[PDB]
Structure 1
């Protein structure tokens, strides 16, 4: 099997969520954080033809950049990964599945309670500014008829009442109010535009980001509230 640069670029983004991954045969890849607060999934154009666990995904992808694009990836005789080039061969170790945290199945995200979106340059600003503004917590809420994202420094503001960054996502014409709180460490989506699906029921809740190439599911913090 071959891996195009569009697939390896996605796998590189998935490596920021989990250092390892479980590849299974088909045209679908997915991963989850070790603590289970972040999930990612994507349909790829390449075809995976065998199941293998990769402990150091980022190191595996770096080696793929050192061979030709038409290099063949197959399972070696001893059960590891064989990368055949024109005049060379690379052997990457196949991890034991017990050392890689992988999701048991793809996430069936329920019907969203509220639907919005975020533009690429807005998502880019939110991510890049969070380091300079010491923002580790965002809240997706409704303020004066609009869905906004407020950034907070949870260390110096446990009550989340000092807005350091505010981003207006769009209009919201619904009587339902909510304040979905997300840890900034879980905003691992690659650059681009995303359709934002917000779901909450009882003390459970999650947010789904639908992009052009992948989906991201992020758990909500316990301080989140909603009234439907």
Structure 2
């Protein structure tokens, strides 16, 4: 079963959240942070056919980039993984599904208590200029009636009152206020326009980022405030 180049790109994006997975049959892959807080899901053009655990999925994708694309990939006789060229026959050791944790399911994300979307250059801009200003956390909150993305230095300011960078996707008509706080390390997502869903219930809360290749549901931090 072939792993397409777009398949390899999404496998790259998922191997970031985890250097391994338990591949499960379907046209879909998904993985969880080791903490399970920020999660990745993606219905992929390739259809998984044999459920197989892999430990170094990043290195597995390296191995993939070491062999030609249309090599037939199967689960080998001893249970391991066979990459088959016209000549090359390679057995990558198939992992144990308990050495690598998998997410329970694709997160049935709740309804968004607020909606916006972040442009490609928007997310690129925030996440990359965070290096110049040393931004370590983000505050998405109602500001001037807008869903603003304030890059806060939670090391230098745990209160998130000293902005060095903000991002304003668009104004959000609302009286019910909030100041969602989410780790800059929760931003496992690749660049690109990501529809931002801000679900807010009590203290449970999430930002669902719906990109061009995967949905990542991010559990809001305990400091994310929301008020309806």
Q: So what's the TM-score if we normalise by structure 1?
A: 0.98
Gaps (5+ residues) in structure 2?
none
Are 1:27 and 2:27 counterparts? yes
Which structure 2 residues correspond to residues 22-171 of structure 1 after superposition, within 5 A? 22-171=22-171
Secondary structure of the 1:186 match is coil
* Aligned residues: CA RMSD: 0.9
Cα deviation digits, residues 104-163 of structure 1 (max 9, x gap): 111101111000000000100111111221111100001111110101111111111100
Cα deviation digits, residues 30-72 of structure 1 (max 9, x gap): 0000011210101111111100111000000011112111111
Distance 1:19 1:136 in 2: 23
Deviates more, 1:3-12 or 1:63-72: 63-72
Preserved CA contact (<8 Å) 2:144 2:171 = no
Q: State how many pairs are aligned.
A: 228
Distance 2:21 2:136 in 1: 26
Secondary structure of the 1:65 match is helix
Cα deviation digits, residues 183-214 of structure 1 (max 9, x gap): 01110111211111110111110110111211
Q: So what's the TM-score if we normalise by structure 2?
A: 0.98
Secondary structure of the 1:176 match is coil
Gaps (5+ residues) in structure 1?
none
